[PDB]
Design a binder for this molecule. Sequence first.
Ligand SMILES: Nc1ncnc2c1ncn2[C@@H]1O[C@H](COP(=O)(O)OP(=O)(O)OP(=O)(O)O)[C@@H](O)[C@H]1O
Ligand SMILES: [Mg+2]
Ligand SMILES: [Mg+2]
Ligand SMILES: [Mg+2]
Ligand SMILES: [Mg+2]
Ligand SMILES: [Mg+2]
Lengths: 49, 132, 80, 205, 101, 357, 52
Amino acid sequence: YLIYFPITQDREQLMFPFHFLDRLERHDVTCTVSGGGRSAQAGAIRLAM
Amino acid sequence: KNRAARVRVAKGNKPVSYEEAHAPHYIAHRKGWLSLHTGNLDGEDHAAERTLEDVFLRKFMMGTFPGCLADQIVLKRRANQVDICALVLRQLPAHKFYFLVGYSETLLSHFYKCPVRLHLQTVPSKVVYKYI
Amino acid sequence: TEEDMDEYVWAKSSSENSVLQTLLQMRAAESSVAPSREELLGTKEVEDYQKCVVRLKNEGENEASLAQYKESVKRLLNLA
Amino acid sequence: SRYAPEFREPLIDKEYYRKPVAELTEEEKYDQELKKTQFIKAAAATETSSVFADPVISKFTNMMMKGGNKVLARSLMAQTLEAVKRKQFEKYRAASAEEQATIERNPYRIFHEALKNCEPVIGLVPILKGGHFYQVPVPLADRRRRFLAMKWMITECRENKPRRTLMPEKLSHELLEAFHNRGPVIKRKHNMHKMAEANRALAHY
Amino acid sequence: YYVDWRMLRDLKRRKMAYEYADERLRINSLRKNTILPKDLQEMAGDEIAALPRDSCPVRIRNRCVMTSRPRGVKRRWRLSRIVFRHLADHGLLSGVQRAIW
Amino acid sequence: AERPRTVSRTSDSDPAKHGEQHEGQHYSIPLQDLKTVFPHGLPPRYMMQVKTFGEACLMVRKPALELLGYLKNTNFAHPAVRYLLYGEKGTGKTLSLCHAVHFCARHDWLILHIPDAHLWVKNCRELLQSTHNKQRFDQPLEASTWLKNFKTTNERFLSQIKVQEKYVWNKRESTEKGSPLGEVVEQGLTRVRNATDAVGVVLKELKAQSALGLFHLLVAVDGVNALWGRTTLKKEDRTLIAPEELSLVHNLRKMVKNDWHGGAIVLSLSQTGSLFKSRTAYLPHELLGKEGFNALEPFLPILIPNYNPKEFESSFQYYLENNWLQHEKASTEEGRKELRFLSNCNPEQLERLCASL
Amino acid sequence: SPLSEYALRMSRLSARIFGEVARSTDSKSMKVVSLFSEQPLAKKKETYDWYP
RNA sequence: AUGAAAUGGGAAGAAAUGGGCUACAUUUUCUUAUAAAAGAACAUUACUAUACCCUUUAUGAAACUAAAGGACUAAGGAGGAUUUAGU
Ligand SMILES: Nc1ncnc2c1ncn2[C@@H]1O[C@H](COP(=O)(O)OP(=O)(O)OP(=O)(O)O)[C@@H](O)[C@H]1O
Ligand SMILES: [Mg+2]
Ligand SMILES: [Mg+2]
Ligand SMILES: [Mg+2]
Ligand SMILES: [Mg+2]
Ligand SMILES: [Mg+2]
């Protein structure tokens, strides 16, 4: 995710689900996002997670 | 204001049919298409030629059955077959209709080089959807 | 030529020359009499190095395959 | 808007949801039970539970963005904060133990206290009466007072800087110079207040 | 009778371009290359010019088949925007509806 | 807590002492060794950290410990071994290579350190032709800057080593055989036209004389993937140049060959600054290509990974030990866990995130 | 990159098999192949039978 | 003949005005990647011509058209009253 999402705001968007429930570093996620731009793909993953 | 294909309001005494009552934006919603061919489907050719044949076929049927058409005709193309479905008033004698069918079929089959059939449903009088 | 070939062939390649030249310099430093070409390229150390380079060129290059190549170099070059 | 009026703004406060039930005021307690039967808007792309998210700075970033280039605007603000931290670290190391105590090295605290020092209490709304322009003293809301401070900073740096200087180097030099109540932006606030004093009589109009 | 004299001239232009298509193809091929002597290419440039002007296929204009309108035509049906709209708005075109979205 | 803060520093300033016990501990590089061993070659952002913190401290790590081990057991009689540090962006390849340059520098090796080799294949504003071979070109400014730094690092060895041949710089100026190698360096700086030729003499002299046992030679080239790639320099005909045609690139390609002995070659790959390479390319064959890979084999690839849990905590405490992380929530466990996610333990990303904070 | 002899002789062997242009032909001279491989605009049924 | 057809033309502006386009740069310019990052440029032509002029290619029967280079480069330094659009 650091390689796929070189922008911080995209990574922060993936941090929101786990950080909110204090579950950082406790799960292993495998994503497959097709379509849209960088921000739309991070947002789509956030909801899927 | 939009003036296209809208039979405008009179004073409640104008008898409009179902087809005439509905404006263009009701096509594919409340009323269908009078002609059905495959020439406007995606990746299909000969739209220009199918449309020109339709324009003529409608003018031919009006003149061949003058004053005897209750509503617009429906054209149905399947393979090379053409089928004309017309609502016709019961004004003319029965034997006269057999003449115009034999004539109009043979004439249009030798003009467009396809098998053409005429389907006539006779009504006692024009069917009125509403009075506008 | 080598560029045309789609599947790497270690035999008679830039790798074989580079490997043979290194092994010749290694035996010369040892003060041994100049050895034969077949002798140097028949050793097991050179056998393994052939397999690893071929894997990198044909099978694909990745951290796992590069780790295998690292070990072959250590054996071939007598590195601790 | 694509959100029906029944939708509710999302609440992204991590501590609030995890507080013990008894610690919540009954008004707040009521809203939680009500929201269970309501629709909630999806959270914005820049809305997170991060502990490093500052709303004031996030707003300042959007007021610098041009043409939807958020990456560049955030980069400029990130470079600014670093340029302010690095300017205070140099001063701190090159200062005596007594001076070292006063020196502030937190860029987030220099940014907030800078903006606050540039916020004007009163305003001036220009009016036209009888074919002349009579601007009159006005009172400004908490939203209008904050907007003016941020706008005045982003406009001093954008315009009144040398051609080869960059925004992270002009903005850093102004947040710190404002943080000490001596910058040109502070003068803009002083000029606003001094004009309002002059127009005290024209407030009636 | 065609719609107007402008449609008649175009119809003739379309029938004379069909007659001289092979000729203008064979001759023009001699000019669109760099393999033949420039003396031959300059001469083929004059044989093509000597052909009648109505053989030239760039003088054909697409006109509405029913009203002979030069502009506003849709090439898939060969009708002007005004004529196309009359057939479409009455349900007479198979599958054409108004676009609501 | 500050338990990793004790693990965030080590008292062993000398690179030889370092071992596995010292992993994840930051050793301070002496001030004199910064202005002598490292006048160039340190990353630009790292140099900013050295100026603000007032001290250079390099974390001891397993990749750089493996390299120091091979250098200690070097068999000088055997041909030189090429060590290739390959890793993803920001993983620390340049600073791992600088750790080796400190170890060799303290053992009295002769340092031949090319700080960045991409700078020689792009953005050149003066490109002359070479008298030695008219087909090649000469980069006066690129060579002149390197010589001034090479002089500083090896100033001690510039009087002992002496040229073994005669070099005619101009009709009126030549170098007599036997004169100190410093004279060759002095002429290059004095007359910029010969700068690209003085460099070639220096590289040639050191390579030949090293085998005589007088001195050891560390050829430390960072960004070696530039040599066998493409350039963005154009000839008077506005036609792009090739790497070989350039004189500096041509000479260096010889030094990175294993046809000599008496030293070791330490190479590093960097996609940053690379021309015509993807952003996500880090592997040796992707960056070196078919030409570069064949040139350097057999080489020893040393992967530089991301910070491990021990290394990340030590780096986090080092920033806290210098008061860099000034945000109130940075010291907390929720801040630390956040920075671990956003950075992903990448050394460069962690340095960038903490810079703003 | 340049095309070595093996590459070039293979390319000619392929063109000979697939009925493609075998020689080195300029972009200008490739229009002759287009003119004689495509129906001309005036010979297409849409043009000459545009009108009823 | 106010009808039909063929050939050749249907020109310009020390002018005013509406709309659009580009620029006036540092949140910028050039290059590689890609919008990440890096190396250079950065005031007299640095930013900056979708004009003129000069070449080449494309369509055509016809270049008077379009595109791409080349040089040439002038003005422009964010625009008075006033006015447009956007929840
Ligand atoms: N051993 C280390 N000690 C201290 N900081 C380190 C170390 N390794 C990496 N870092 C941090 O990571 C940053 C990047 O390091 P470095 O430049 O060595 O990486 P790299 O992999 O060579 O990068 P690139 O691919 O861009 O060339 C440094 O500026 C520093 O903040
Ligand atoms: Mg035309
Ligand atoms: Mg590096
Ligand atoms: Mg007339
Ligand atoms: Mg960018
Ligand atoms: Mg032409």
